[model samples]
Target: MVILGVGYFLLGLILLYYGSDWFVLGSERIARHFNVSNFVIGATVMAIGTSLPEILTSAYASYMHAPGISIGNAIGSCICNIGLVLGLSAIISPIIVDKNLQKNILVYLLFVIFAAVIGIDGFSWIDGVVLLILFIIYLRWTVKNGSAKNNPSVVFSLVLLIIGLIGVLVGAELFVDGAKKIALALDISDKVIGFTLVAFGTSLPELMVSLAAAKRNLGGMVLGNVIGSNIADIGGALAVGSLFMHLPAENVQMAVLVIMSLLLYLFAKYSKIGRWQGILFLALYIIAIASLRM
Candidate 1:
């Protein structure tokens, strides 16, 4: 069992790293070819790409009737993505908050809080309805903003983007399969891996995108991607989970959600997240994972 777990964990990590690299490279190239601002691309394309892992992994857990695993994994990934992933990424370099992205931040905060509330008492179709509405709003806003034009050879860039997206999906599947197998073999609770390792696994995309964007001084893009990903985490990921499986609420999970949502709100309100903020968020994440055992 130990060997199997170690094997799965190693294989999953390898696939996850390469897969995320492929995704970022391909998606980024396509976005650049079209002359789209990184901010817009991050909000629309990169955000969804990075979050595909969480969506699929949680969906699989839901399919297996492991509501606790699904719900915990989703909420846990959210905390890690927003708090730990974003914080560490920002500490590498301060990300500039764009006004447009800031507007979206408020919406993200509302949905996070709303999702926490719904998850606390068990999610319903109404939560799905709300998510659908929010998705529509996001779509409307994007279309209104509209991406830049592809000057030459639109089809080629489009094809490249499609291939990159495919790579991300396939990679995520391989990664998750190996990780889940290893977890079961090791007799480690799904909740533990889901909260810690798997959460980090699925968050790899965000980390890559943010780091790349930050390195290029595309701070607004990084900020937009983080906020947008969180929005999708709740509105798209959790909403879809509820639609496919009837997930129940537990005290521990609910408490985690509330704590995470509040932490996100506080972070965004401050605007400039420094090393101290990063350390604080990282600390909170550790405590949240520890509390799960109690």
Candidate 2:
């Protein structure tokens, strides 16, 4: 069981990595054909694509009655997305945000607050419904007005997008299964593994892609991707997970969530997560993992 689990998890990670590559390339090509700006694509399509693993992993875990796994996946991913991924990207080079895109930063703060409130009381089915409603609102507000130039290549690109999505789903399953097994074998609790290993593993693509974007001086893309990803991380992943299972409102988990949110807000306002901030974030992340060990 241990070996099988580990194998499955590793395979899943591989699939997830390649799947994302294919999806992003295909989507970018398609979006470009339609003359969509990087910001719009990042906000709507790319964010969704990058978040696919978190979405599917949590939902599947919830369906399997592993509510802890689901919650852990979401929270872990959030920490990795912001702390590990964004922090490293910024440290590599300064990332700039479009003045207009600051709205996404506000949205992230609001959802984090909302998530904390819901979590404090324990997330129930009703909260799930509400979250889903909010997700719809976010989708409509963010993407509805954005126009995608429908061109002949769009159909081909959409086909490729579907194929890439399928790969991502398959990869995520293998990765999660393997991850769970490996955690057990290593005597790591599911929550601990989810919060640390799986979270960091799944966020690998974001870190690499965002860093590359920053290196190219496409700093705006980094902000859009990070901000958009955080919203989806909290809103889409948590909301979807709640639909399948009720998340426990543990004091520790709540505290972590609140801290993560506050840190994210400060990072956004600071506008430049320099080397010092990167070091601080890495230290905090290490502390978080250490706490899990205890």
Q: What is the lDDT of candidate 2?
A: 0.67
Top candidate by lDDT = 2
Backbone clash total for model 2 is 2
lDDT on C-alpha atoms for all candidate structures: 0.65, 0.67
Off by over 4 Å in 1: 1-15, 32-36, 142-160, 166-169, 172-200, 250-270
Could you give candidate 1's per-residue lDDT for residues 1-294 as a string of tens digits? 556656655654555555545555555666677676666677778787778877776678777776656666666667766567766766776654545555566666676666666666786657766875786587558535646455456566566556655655555555655677767776775565655666666776677557656666566667667766766676776667777777777557556656665665566566566566667777777777676642
Error of 2 at 103 (Å): 1.5
Tens-digit per-residue lDDT, 1-294, candidate 2: 788997887777776666655665566666577576565666667677677777877788888897777777677767666667667766776645444455656676687778778788777778877876776677667654445455667776787666765666667657766877777787876655555565565565466456655555555556556666766766777778888889776456546756766776566565655666667777776677667632
Whose TM-score is greatest here?
1
Give me the runs in candidate 2 sitting further than 4 Å from their true place: 1-25, 29-36, 144-201, 211-215
User: TM per model?
Assistant: 0.76, 0.74
